[PDB]
Protein backbone atom coordinates (compact mmCIF):
# COMPACT_ATOMS: atom_id res chain seq x y z
CA UNK A 1 0.00 0.00 0.00
CA UNK A 2 2.85 2.40 0.79
CA UNK A 3 4.58 1.63 -2.52
CA UNK A 4 1.32 2.00 -4.45
CA UNK A 5 0.72 5.71 -3.88
CA UNK A 6 2.64 8.95 -3.37
CA UNK A 7 0.23 10.54 -0.89
CA UNK A 8 1.08 7.81 1.63
CA UNK A 9 4.78 8.55 1.10
CA UNK A 10 4.22 12.26 1.74
CA UNK A 11 2.18 11.45 4.86
CA UNK A 12 5.01 9.28 6.21
CA UNK A 13 7.57 12.02 5.54
CA UNK A 14 5.35 14.63 7.20
CA UNK A 15 4.84 12.45 10.28
CA UNK A 16 8.60 11.88 10.59
CA UNK A 17 9.28 15.62 10.32
CA UNK A 18 6.63 16.44 12.93
CA UNK A 19 8.06 13.86 15.34
CA UNK A 20 11.57 15.25 14.85
CA UNK A 21 10.34 18.79 15.51
CA UNK A 22 8.45 17.74 18.64
CA UNK A 23 11.49 15.84 19.93
CA UNK A 24 14.35 18.29 19.27
CA UNK A 25 12.79 21.77 19.32
CA UNK A 26 14.11 24.74 21.30
CA UNK A 27 13.88 28.54 21.46
CA UNK A 28 15.53 31.50 19.72
CA UNK A 29 18.53 33.36 21.17
CA UNK A 30 19.31 36.14 18.67
CA UNK A 31 17.21 39.30 18.33
CA UNK A 32 16.58 41.04 15.00
CA UNK A 33 16.09 44.82 14.83
CA UNK A 34 15.63 47.35 12.01
CA UNK A 35 18.55 49.65 11.18
CA UNK A 36 19.26 51.55 14.38
CA UNK A 37 20.00 55.19 13.60
CA UNK A 38 23.14 57.21 14.36
CA UNK A 39 23.86 60.04 16.81
CA UNK A 40 24.97 63.52 15.73
CA UNK A 41 26.66 64.15 19.14
CA UNK A 42 24.62 67.37 19.53
CA UNK A 43 21.33 65.84 20.72
CA UNK A 44 23.13 64.35 23.74
CA UNK A 45 24.03 67.80 25.12
CA UNK A 46 21.27 69.92 26.64
CA UNK A 47 20.86 73.38 25.10
CA UNK A 48 20.91 76.25 27.59
CA UNK A 49 22.65 79.54 28.44
Amino acid sequence: RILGSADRLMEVIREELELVREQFGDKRRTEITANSADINLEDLITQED
Binding site: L3, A6, L9, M10
Partner: protein, 67 residues
Amino acid sequence: LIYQPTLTEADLSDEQTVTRWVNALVSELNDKEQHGSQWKFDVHTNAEQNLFEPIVRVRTHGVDTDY
Protein backbone atom coordinates in the same frame (compact mmCIF):
# COMPACT_ATOMS: atom_id res chain seq x y z
CA LEU B 1 19.70 1.21 -26.45
CA ILE B 2 22.75 -0.98 -27.12
CA TYR B 3 20.69 -4.15 -27.64
CA GLN B 4 17.77 -2.57 -29.46
CA PRO B 5 17.73 -2.40 -33.28
CA THR B 6 19.27 0.73 -34.74
CA LEU B 7 16.87 3.53 -35.68
CA THR B 8 17.88 5.52 -38.76
CA GLU B 9 16.97 8.99 -39.97
CA ALA B 10 15.01 7.57 -42.92
CA ASP B 11 12.75 5.76 -40.42
CA LEU B 12 11.76 9.02 -38.68
CA SER B 13 8.77 9.65 -40.98
CA ASP B 14 7.01 6.27 -41.17
CA GLU B 15 5.09 6.83 -37.88
CA GLN B 16 4.69 3.04 -37.66
CA THR B 17 8.26 1.76 -37.26
CA VAL B 18 8.79 4.40 -34.56
CA THR B 19 5.69 3.30 -32.63
CA ARG B 20 6.68 -0.37 -32.57
CA TRP B 21 10.31 0.49 -31.78
CA VAL B 22 9.38 2.64 -28.77
CA ASN B 23 6.76 0.13 -27.61
CA ALA B 24 9.35 -2.66 -27.65
CA LEU B 25 11.86 -0.46 -25.81
CA VAL B 26 9.34 0.44 -23.10
CA SER B 27 8.21 -3.18 -22.71
CA GLU B 28 11.83 -4.31 -22.32
CA LEU B 29 12.46 -1.56 -19.75
CA ASN B 30 9.36 -2.52 -17.76
CA ASP B 31 10.25 -6.23 -17.87
CA LYS B 32 13.57 -5.90 -16.03
CA GLU B 33 12.68 -3.16 -13.53
CA GLN B 34 13.70 -3.85 -9.93
CA HIS B 35 13.51 -0.41 -8.24
CA GLY B 36 9.81 0.48 -8.51
CA SER B 37 9.88 2.69 -11.62
CA GLN B 38 7.15 2.78 -14.26
CA TRP B 39 7.69 3.46 -17.96
CA LYS B 40 5.33 4.83 -20.60
CA PHE B 41 5.73 6.14 -24.14
CA ASP B 42 4.34 8.86 -26.39
CA VAL B 43 4.81 9.91 -30.02
CA HIS B 44 5.19 13.57 -30.99
CA THR B 45 4.21 14.81 -34.45
CA ASN B 46 6.08 17.76 -35.95
CA ALA B 47 4.31 19.96 -38.50
CA GLU B 48 7.53 21.19 -40.14
CA GLN B 49 9.01 18.07 -41.78
CA ASN B 50 6.21 15.63 -40.81
CA LEU B 51 8.66 13.93 -38.45
CA PHE B 52 7.74 11.73 -35.47
CA GLU B 53 10.02 12.17 -32.45
CA PRO B 54 9.70 9.50 -29.74
CA ILE B 55 9.01 10.52 -26.14
CA VAL B 56 9.77 8.43 -23.04
CA ARG B 57 8.05 9.06 -19.70
CA VAL B 58 9.03 7.59 -16.33
CA ARG B 59 7.79 7.89 -12.74
CA THR B 60 10.53 7.57 -10.11
CA HIS B 61 10.01 8.23 -6.38
CA GLY B 62 6.60 9.67 -7.21
CA VAL B 63 7.99 12.25 -9.66
CA ASP B 64 7.13 12.32 -13.37
CA THR B 65 9.61 13.33 -16.07
CA ASP B 66 9.59 13.34 -19.88
CA TYR B 67 12.68 12.69 -22.02
